[PDB]
Amino acid sequence: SWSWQVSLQYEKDGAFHHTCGGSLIAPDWVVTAGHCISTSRTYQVVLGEYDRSVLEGSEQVIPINAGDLFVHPLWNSNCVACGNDIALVKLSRSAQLGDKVQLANLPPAGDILPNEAPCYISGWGRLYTGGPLPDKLQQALLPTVDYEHCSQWDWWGITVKKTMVCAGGDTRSGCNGDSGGPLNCPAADGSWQVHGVTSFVSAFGCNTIKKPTVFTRVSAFIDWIDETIASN
Amino acid sequence: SWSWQVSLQYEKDGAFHHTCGGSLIAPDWVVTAGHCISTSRTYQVVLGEYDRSVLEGSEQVIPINAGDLFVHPLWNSNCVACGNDIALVKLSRSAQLGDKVQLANLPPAGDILPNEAPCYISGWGRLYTGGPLPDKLQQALLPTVDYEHCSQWDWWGITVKKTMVCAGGDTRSGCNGDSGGPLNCPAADGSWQVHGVTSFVSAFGCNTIKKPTVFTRVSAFIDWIDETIASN
């Protein structure tokens, strides 16, 4: 199984630092979390192709123009539970992708996953900070917890909205992913759709019981994604 | 540089699962976070001595007696920002220590760290979930952000109390640590002291700018720690 992995990095102190994952949906578009972007910082995207969990070839490093960052207009970092934690990043040039990997598909607008749906997260378990990409990738099964279950009082209660997906919160943790990292799920036909970008976790961190990682439901923002991509 | 690393684990579905780190402060006492403990669960601690991030020899697995988990009386999981997130775990037998890494020392009661003090976190980055202890330890410098700076409105504001220690919040990520894991600082004498046990992180996770990881300040609870150990 081949994938393209994303690291979004910002410059400080004459070096770039990993801040979020993201999902390469087009050779020059990345979907990530809005919380990942301040348009004041200088950004670059580092890409790396993985066969299974093994890095193949060389990383590609692509600078980003301020204004090629498209944060959702309703995103407000002072209110994570208000949702809308989603952003598009247009690469300043197209990544060179070859043709090993079928890029993750945008899910059908309004698509809601069934309770216990098998989805997966991949990433560097937030241990990658900058520099040469890790030669290995972490991947894990995070079954979804539908709104009805996720909003139980002892789970996320009234904190979650229906524009969010919860996944995990039991024995398996979501610590293998990254901030802004994608939640991928297998379509009927068998493709992979990005169903979520990682938004938030409990105050106690990833892997806390009954507090699944909460993802921005990408299927609730299709309109804005299309309209944004088509305009730029 | 030596250190005894602690994995506190709870039994679920017939196996043990890592839930928190902690610090071995005596041959049969571990300090950790109160949020790590549910008195209804069955626990064991797995200990490993690491030198320069590599496991020395083999792990030790020590069961915890029912009733040998002591949570601070003021710990309320409904109020993380209230503080008091601290607990002691008595080991059913003493760890086998050899004579390489001396134990983590408790700080003097009331001891406050300077702003920017070079402290360290070590752990498995929440990637270790159970089974044989990882051969390698993650360690990172995580400088202290004193209460004056951490309580800034744009940092943690009113959420942090004087009974907590902040560390990080800039380019240096706190993602290498574990829930309940120690913040270890060098003392004037050259010994290492546990000044904190990891309590909470921002909703965005462990590597969030202007949201340093927040530790329970161990030096605020020396009376309770000492009393609990002397009595049990």
Concatenate the DSSP letters of all residues of A93-150 into one string: S----TTS--PPBPPPTT--PPTT---EEEE-TT---SSSPPSB-EEEE--EE-HHHH
DSSP single-letter state for residue B149: H
Instruction: Report the Cα B229 to chain-centroid distance in Å.
Output: 17
Q: Does B157 touch chain A (CB under 8 A)?
A: no
Contact B201 A205 (CB under 8 A): yes
Q: Does B217 touch chain A (CB under 8 A)?
A: no
Residue B55, strand partner residues: B50
Of B7, B18, B35, B178, the catalytic one is: B35
Q: Which of B11, B80, B82, B204 to mutate against chain A (most A CBs within 10 Å)? A: B204
Q: Which helix (H) or strand (E) holds A4?
A: strand A2-12
User: What is the side-by-side strand order in the sheet with B23-26?
Assistant: B23-26, B29-32, B87-90, B69-71
**A181 → chain B, closest CA residue:** B204
Method used to solve the structure:
X-ray
Residues B82, B208, A183, CA angle at the centre, nearest 5°?
105
Question: Count of A–B CB contacts within 8 Å?
Answer: 74
Token pair belonging to A154: 């002892």
Q: Say how far apart CA B154 and CA B144 lie, in whole Å.
A: 17
Token pair belonging to A40: 């004041």
Q: Does B211 touch chain A (CB under 8 A)?
A: no
Q: Domain ranges for chain B, please list them.
A: 1-2+104-219, 3-103+220-232
Contact B206 A204 (CB under 8 A): no
Residue A58's nearest CA partner among A111, A123, A138, A133 is A133
Q: Which chain A residues are within 8 Å of B126, Cβ to Cβ?
A: 125, 173, 175, 205-207
Q: Which helix (H) or strand (E) holds A47?
A: strand A43-51
Contact B127 A175 (CB under 8 A): yes
Q: Does A207 touch chain B (CB under 8 A)?
A: yes
Contact B203 A201 (CB under 8 A): yes
C-alpha distances (whole Å) from A59 to each of A5, A29, A48 are: 10, 17, 5
Q: Say how far apart CA A142 and CA A168 lie, in whole Å.
A: 5
- CB atoms near residue A93 (< 10 Å): 10
Give the largest CA-CA distance in chain B: 48
Q: Which of residues 85-114 of A touch B (CB under 8 A)?
A: none
Token pair belonging to A1: 């199984």
Q: Which chain B residues are within 8 Å of A19, Cβ to Cβ?
A: 207
- CB atoms near residue A191 (< 10 Å): 13
Q: Which residue has the tokens 């070079």?
A: B118
CATH number of A1-2+104-219: 2.40.10.10
For residue A122, report the phi and psi dihedrals to the nearest 5 degrees.
-135, 150
Q: Which chain B residues are within 8 Å of A125, Cβ to Cβ?
A: 125-127, 175
CATH code 2.40.10.10 for A3-103+220-232: yes
Instruction: Report the Cα B84 to chain-centroid distance in Å.
Output: 13
Nearest CB to A125; choose among B35, B125, B203: B125
Contact B205 A126 (CB under 8 A): yes
Strands (E), chain B: 2-12, 15-20, 23-26, 29-32, 43-51, 54-63, 69-71, 87-90, 120-123, 138-141, 144-145, 164-167, 182-186, 192-200, 213-217
B1-2+104-219 shares its CATH topology with B3-103+220-232: yes
Contact B126 A13 (CB under 8 A): no
**B171 → chain A, closest CA residue:** A17
Contact B200 A204 (CB under 8 A): yes
Residue A44, strand partner residues: A9, A63
Nearest CB to A127; choose among B176, B179, B204: B176
CB-CB contact of B182 with B217 (8 Å): no
Residues 6 or more apart whose Cβ sits within 8 Å of residue B20? B7, B8, B32, B33, B36, B178, B179, B180, B181
Q: Does B17 touch chain A (CB under 8 A)?
A: yes
Length of chain A: 232
Token pair belonging to B125: 């980055």
The one-letter amino acid at B167: A
C-alpha distances (whole Å) from A44 to each of A92, A178, B38, B49, B192 are: 9, 17, 44, 39, 39
C-alpha distances (whole Å) from A111 to each of A2, A158, A223 are: 25, 22, 13
**A176 → chain B, closest CA residue:** B127
Q: Which residue has the tokens 């923002």?
A: A221
